Amino acid sequence: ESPKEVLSRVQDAGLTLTNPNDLYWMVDFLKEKYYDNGDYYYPIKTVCDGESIDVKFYCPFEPSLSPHYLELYGSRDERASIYETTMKKYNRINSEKTSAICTPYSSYGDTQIVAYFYSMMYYINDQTAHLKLPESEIESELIDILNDDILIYLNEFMSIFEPEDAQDLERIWDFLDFYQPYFSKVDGKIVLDEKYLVRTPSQMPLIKTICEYVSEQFAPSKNITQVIWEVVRYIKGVKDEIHIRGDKSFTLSLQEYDDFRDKVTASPMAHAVSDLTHERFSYEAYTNPAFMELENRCSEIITYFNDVCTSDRERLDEDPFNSVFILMDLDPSLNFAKSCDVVVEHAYNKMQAFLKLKEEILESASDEEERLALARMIKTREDSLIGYVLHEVCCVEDGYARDHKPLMKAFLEEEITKSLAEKVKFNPV
Ligand SMILES: CC(C)=CCC/C(C)=C/CSP(=O)(O)OP(=O)(O)O
Numbered sequence: 001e002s003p004k005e006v007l008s009r010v011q012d013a014g015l016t017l018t019n020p021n022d023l024y025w026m027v028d029f030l031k032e033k034y035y036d037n038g039d040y041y042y043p044i045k046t047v048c049d050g051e052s053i054d055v056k057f058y059c060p061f062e063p064s065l066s067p068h069y070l071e072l073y074g075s076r077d078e079r080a081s082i083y084e085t086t087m088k089k090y091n092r093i094n095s096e097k098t099s100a101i102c103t104p105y106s107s108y109g110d111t112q113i114v115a116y117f118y119s120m121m122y123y124i125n126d127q128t129a130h131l132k133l134p135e136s137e138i139e140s141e142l143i144d145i146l147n148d149d150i151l152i153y154l155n156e157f158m159s160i161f162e163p164e165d166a167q168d169l170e171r172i173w174d175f176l177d178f179y180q181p182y183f184s185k186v187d188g189k190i191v192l193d194e195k196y197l198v199r200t201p202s203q204m205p206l207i208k209t210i211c212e213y214v215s216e217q218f219a220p221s222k223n224i225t226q227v228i229w230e231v232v233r234y235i236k237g238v239k240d241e242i243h244i245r246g247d248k249s250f251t252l253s254l255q256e257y258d259d260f261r262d263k264v265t266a267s268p269m270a271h272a273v274s275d276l277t278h279e280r281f282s283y284e285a286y287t288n289p290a291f292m293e294l295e296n297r298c299s300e301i302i303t304y305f306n307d308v309c310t311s312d313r314e315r316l317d318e319d320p321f322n323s324v325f326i327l328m329d330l331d332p333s334l335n336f337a338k339s340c341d342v343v344v345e346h347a348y349n350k351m352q353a354f355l356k357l358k359e360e361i362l363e364s365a366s367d368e369e370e371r372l373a374l375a376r377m378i379k380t381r382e383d384s385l386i387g388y389v390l391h392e393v394c395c396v397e398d399g400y401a402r403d404h405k406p407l408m409k410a411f412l413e414e415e416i417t418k419s420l421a422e423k424v425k426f427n428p429v
């Protein structure tokens, strides 16, 4: 469309998330107003316990939206039929918007597989959210189902894992930890004992769709051990969350919260698959201690941004898994607004630590092939950082985001109207 057509639509109907064209103009505006002016502080306007939350998320990476978002959104109904879900739940998760904005320069299939991985985390997280309820309402059968589901999900990723190097087989085997007694090494493959294939989990078609794509697109030609490794780390992290939530006694420090969030942010899974889509790729980076820390910083940055945006909803859930609430429990002088400011500052320092590790990792490269591979893999994680910022910024329609921000809807509609009008006036210059 032309800027004149969109300006007329915005002046009449405002900004929506149901018209997928609006998101292209929102991301384009955010790049022009902020990134293109050297301003890397993107506004977040929400509320928590009636307090005004008006902060800026620092991220100096180029904003972009996937060209496949139109087709991804146009096929959202057939994509949702894979899931056991209501459309209200599927619309709030909005994996089409998440993947398109965090994986902006990939093929249609390589973008959709990222949407599948993020949707897997959201549906498993919502199943784990039953433990948020007070103990008077927790059903043991649902916990039994959850514990059995993640073990069956884990085995389905094991069924597509047949590494060419026996050392990679031992890497996953030793990483199973408390899940190892359930599995056995049978002819170069890790197999769950058939005694434990008890049920068909509710989201098994989703997990089978993921494993089918990974085994058909990357397994014949690439080493998919890290994709399996990050899935094991995530599934183990979910088990740790079940243990903590099931105990109903949250005593995690901010450092322990970071260590836990390093496992369950799920973005390392999407990065592992996205790394296999580029020729510039170094599997040895996954065991580099500096690269592992860079991935941990990325997960914590996304966590802290999420903690600010989801604070009010999780406050009503009485969910203690939030750095805003952990800091308030430690410091009684902090309200929700002052605590969010501290979290935003922590996210800035983690971003500087991310950029410092980046410079050290690229300098430690042995040859040009390794340098270009490391730079490509770090760029993939930078795409997710700016992508998640804009993801929360562009929550402008209620029901199509986990945390609708009506103040951002008003702010973006007012600001994009002035920007589009300036485009129409100076046209065609
Ligand atoms: C969306 C992307 C790019 C990565 C994952 C970020 C993310 C929202 C992780 C889960 S945070 P968690 O508190 O577990 O979940 P919510 O209640 O905020 O939905």
Ligand SMILES: [Mg+2]
Binding pocket: 314, 319, 321, 322
């Ligand atoms: Mg949380």
Ligand SMILES: [Mn+2]
Binding pocket: 306, 307, 310, 314
């Ligand atoms: Mn959250």
